[model samples]
Target: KLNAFSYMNKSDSTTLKNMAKDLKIYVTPINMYKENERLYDLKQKTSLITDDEDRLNKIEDIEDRQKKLESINEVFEKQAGIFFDKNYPDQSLNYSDDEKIFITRTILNDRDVLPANNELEDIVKEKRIKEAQISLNTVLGNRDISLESIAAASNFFADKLSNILEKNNLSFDDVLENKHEGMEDSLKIDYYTNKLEVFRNAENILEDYYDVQIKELFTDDEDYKAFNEVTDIKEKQQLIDFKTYHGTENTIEMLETGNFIPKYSDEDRKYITEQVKLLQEKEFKPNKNQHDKFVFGAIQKKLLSEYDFDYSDNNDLKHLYQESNEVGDEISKDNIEEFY
Candidate 1:
């Protein structure tokens, strides 16, 4: 069975053609320039829109348009680059079967109307490139014009086409309307922009999106405590002291939920365990620097005895101890001196 297409009314055809013509004009450099001028005027009117000191609401509109315009030109330029140099089929007519009669009989009448092979393909390709290039150039260069122009133009053309298509009882898919969706650009930009605007207006307050209610930024819940279990200021101070030197807080946080091992040996972990043990015993007092020093020295000597480096002569243990020593030297005596 042959698939039948609905007939288009003359009026409907005219409307679609007129819409296309208007869009072609709308997308031109001159129209874009005028639009740019209009946008500048709109931006200038912000002062009139607000009398408040912050001009908070007005600022949002301005920024929203700014981001939206960025996407339009960027996407257009990307799609345009996709149109690189490529040779097309020949446009000139060449008939292998009965050239004289075939050429005379029909479709080869006008070079413009009917191209041979690569010629038609090249024409289409060139036209596509030209259109995309103009779109990209206009959107990218026209900072004054809201990037929403693409969406607006697309929807405006789409609406016109839809109306005509509906009137003629024709399917919209059958027609080639403006390819780039303008209002969709506007909508997408506006959507994300509005979300950001609302987010900013909330000023870090909690809000919901797509069923998730995000917590406030920089705001902490009273009940949520990771390090709050410390019994006293002294204990807290000791923990803080341990964290300052050879602490794994940074490394632990960074490596959390990931497969990561430091370039250094497990010496950091060993030092941390010693520091924590000493801190917990409350034996690592700063005022008794001489006593603390003697204690740490004794501890180091014990590690040397246990590791049996004197007998085993382990290069790895020696290297690890050396690296730990290098790390100790780098530690600021002055920083620790203040607490001591």
Candidate 2:
């Protein structure tokens, strides 16, 4: 009972007790209950119970400053949420509360601090949107500066990724620092633009997005085998019967993993397209037309790929087009006589 608190007088003790109780109420709940701040105020008032009255004033100053910071933080958070929703609707799915606050605070602390702007009335939203576009475009290689590109950019800007970039010895800001108008920057931009396109093309063609694989574009769409069995040249030996080419394969590798492959860009496609018409005129059209046209196409493929016989004088090409209806044509013997 005779300890340090016992020597305290009624009026002074009453004042100290009341100040302590008020500080407790203030720091008890809500945004004002910041732990370290509360702890500091508690410690200051306790130690200064018998010290200078001016010493107790610091807590009030700190409380006022905190309220101002908190007020501004909340307003910016509201505006930043609106900004994020409009600009990057998908991005909010992955951010943490900490990340959201970090993002909002950074906007609050942007290069030109706006005291009067609500983003609509001013350029707060505009500034961040363009900044993100520039920063992302440089890395992602977009030919067009687009919001889709920016959405993808925002995806890459996830807080976890930002941390990974930092620990792995690069800053996210470093990624954004290169000017979009420079030597290697546009080159890098082009690289990613192509990459995004590759991923995009793969996604559309294939199934989904765990990893983008080699996409089968035209062949899956048009199976030459199923089109007409008579014309199925995929099984035909190149030189033996001279039909269905094993078709030359190409590799447009995905910069990320594997590749995207078209079945073949064989110029031989022209033969079948033109064959149905020519054969129809020749009255050789049948379900068997595919078979006959396959042979015709082989000859065309062979001729185009190899030699150029004299078309007008030799009449081989003309004869092939007009008279070679073998199966069920109205070829009178005189037609063959004139053809030879």
Candidate 3:
């Protein structure tokens, strides 16, 4: 169902392969884009071409852009293969000219390809909009607010809200993140303390090397890989969000808990943050610091105690319902009574 072509002679193949390596993309067939451009031009030049000059021009422009993109891709592959062929000979020599050309076309067109998917693209775009709103909110000092996008917004401030928990002396459980492999067990990620400790350290090291805060390290256009040619804000957010999960408690826990724990992902992750906002508002009256200053201190004292755990201390830590301390505790509590 698919066709193939090759433009590179033997020497050109080496150049093209090098270019592909440099680009970290397949050097797709030059003929593929040429073919595509031919068709595209025909569409615009045909009798069906309307008298609307603007539309006709736009059609021509799109074809031209495709050609330019593929040509650049060709240059990239040629350079990459030439430079890295000996060290990365497997990568350079494995592909035929036809394969490389096809890959180039795929790259210039398939926004839905590897590392980021279509759904992730949407999230990145939403995050961009949210970032605009957030910036306005920050300037106005209004928690409840909205704003419109300026011209040509990049994926700046892509992860501001998501970084709140990391900024605080809180666990990853405090903020929401996820892992999304498709295997029943493989897809699950966890947020265990030990793993989180490693992730935290690694993140700190990266931050140090970059000489920037974690938020800045990932968001900046000049240094951040996500900003490079990232036209789709949604895909950018998706990639960033996934990367952030690496050091999170959610990811660690998911890995350790097997399948018993409900794997938190996407909406579930967002819901956790909302839930935390509400719970803190309700339980702490005004702020979490006040609640922590008292309740957390109590837990600390009890934990440091050498004596057998008192019933009162147990009550404070968790709800334990028992009719009496008799032998076997029957599970007789009904739902209504349990709540009351």
Compose the digit string of candidate 2's lDDT tens values, residues 8-85. Answer: 345543543454464454321122324434444344344324445654676566666565445434443454565456
Better of 2 and 3 by TM-score: 3
What is the lDDT of every predicted structure here?
0.36, 0.38, 0.36
Give per-model TM-scores: 0.18, 0.20, 0.23
Worst 10 residues of 1 by lDDT: 209-218
Poorest lDDT segment (10 consecutive residues) of candidate 3: 146-155
lDDT of 3 at 185: 22
lDDT of 1: 0.36
lDDT of 1 by residue, 151-176 (tens): 44345545655554455554534333
RMSD of each: 25.8, 27.9, 23.1
Point out where model 2 deviates above 4 Å: 1-49, 104-340
Candidate 2 matches the true fold with a TM-score of: 0.20
Q: Is candidate 1 or candidate 2 better by TM-score?
A: 2
Q: Give me the displacement of residue 110 in model 1, in angstroms.
A: 19
Query: What's model 1's lDDT at 159?
Result: 64
